[PDB]
Amino acid sequence: YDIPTTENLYFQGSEFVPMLQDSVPLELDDAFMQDPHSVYARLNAEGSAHRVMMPPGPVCGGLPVWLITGYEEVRSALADPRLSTDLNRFSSALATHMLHSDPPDHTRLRKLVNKAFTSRAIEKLRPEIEQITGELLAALPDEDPVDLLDAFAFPLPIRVICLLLGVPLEEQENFKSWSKALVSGDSPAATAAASTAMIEYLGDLIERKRRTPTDDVLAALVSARDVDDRLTETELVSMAFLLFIGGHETTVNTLGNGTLHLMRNLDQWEALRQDRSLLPGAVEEFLRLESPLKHATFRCATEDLRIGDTAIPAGDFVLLALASANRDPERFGDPHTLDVRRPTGGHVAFGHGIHYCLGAPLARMEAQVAFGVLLDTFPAMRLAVDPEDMRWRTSTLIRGLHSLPVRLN
Ligand code: HEM
């Protein structure tokens, strides 16, 4: 750190020092991870696109990307044909999924799976969901500190995803064991074994449901020979895997983020209890205020592009901050406070454009059932520790909590 003084004096007196200082990409420290909404507002005050750099962890590398902040600038980017999720500008099922597909080929996969994710067709799963939630609160621990995130938020999608693919009751516990292994890095070998076991088992379920149709939505996906074309045996597994990882962490932190807020907006935690007709707006307001996905998946510039009067060269990586657009005061009045009664439909927590959340209707209902069952029962709830001591997990795209310590009271 003992840099030669003459060299430093040469740079300081050059008057190029601010320009070189400006061109450095802003490293996203843990302060951003805890409180990015202040960082987004600090950035959007000056522009819409900013050169930022994630800390080593995208794998082990400080990756210079473009962070886009404005609501309309985010929204237009999510619908821009020049901003592809295919970064290319013997493939495994983990690399061929629809989320990474450009509209040329994405349209076919999106339409085939569309029919089975209808709001009403997704409502068939509700009593199977309603009952599944109820077991976890009965099995909830007895003492005051409960860590709601671990005991209820974590297991709920695991049983819901098991319903989604339509796992047979006999082969249930094996699938959940694979799922909990995959979502928690207990050891490199256990997740590696579970990942293969699930992909191979999913492929066998593809064959099993092929000749034996069943009520569950995965069988509806298999039965979808809609255009005289059907999803291929590889594409079924890729679609099913994307449902698993694309739905697990999102639904967990949808519950955790929402429940965390009402713990300090108890005057709105109450209001939800007296009126259950506000729940469909409660979930939307939860997703807008504290979107589980801070940013959409990485996008690459197809051609030369302009965002917020800042040119983006082709081949550059762009990160669309959904949390910034959701908390833009220009689109949502007083964006930093939870108001359950806002008009909905303007938020982009489910993204926008062609890659709009396929599991949105499932995620929509899930929290209302989760919150409502959490509302019908156990209403003396109170947060067990001041949020200042609580942390946020270090993640690239997800906004989630390390824990949700609650007191049942
Ligand atoms: C619970 C709250 C959820 C949130 C906030 C959320 C958020 C998102 C976002 C922002 C995207 C677009 C990402 C991008 O375009 O870069 C997306 C896509 C997707 N999500 Fe989620 N999601 C949620 C729940 C779920 C669930 C429960 C499932 C499945 C069971 C699911 C499956 C998918 C799939 C398959 C896509 C890709 C759709 C496509 O590419 O056409 N999501 N989601």
Side-chain angles (χ1 to χ4, degrees), residues 78 85 97-101 106 110 113-114 117 160-161 164 239 242-255 287 291-293 295-299 320 322 347-360 362-364 366:
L78 282 159
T85 58
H97 59 52
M98 142 195 72
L99 170 50
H100 287 169
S101 265
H106 166 273
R110 191 51 206 243
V113 302
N114 260 347
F117 283 85
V160 172
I161 190 61
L164 258 285
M239 197 41 73
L242 185 41
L243 283 173
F244 164 59
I245 52 165
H248 183 279
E249 284 280 354
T250 82
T251 57
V252 175
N253 299 307
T254 297
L255 269 56
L287 286 159
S291 322
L293 267 83
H295 329 106
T297 44
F298 285 115
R299 263 156 193 79
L320 309 185
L322 305 174
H347 84 90
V348 292
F350 287 122
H352 196 236
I354 70 188
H355 291 293
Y356 188 102
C357 180
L358 177 52
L362 177 77
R364 285 235 149 78
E366 255 209 81

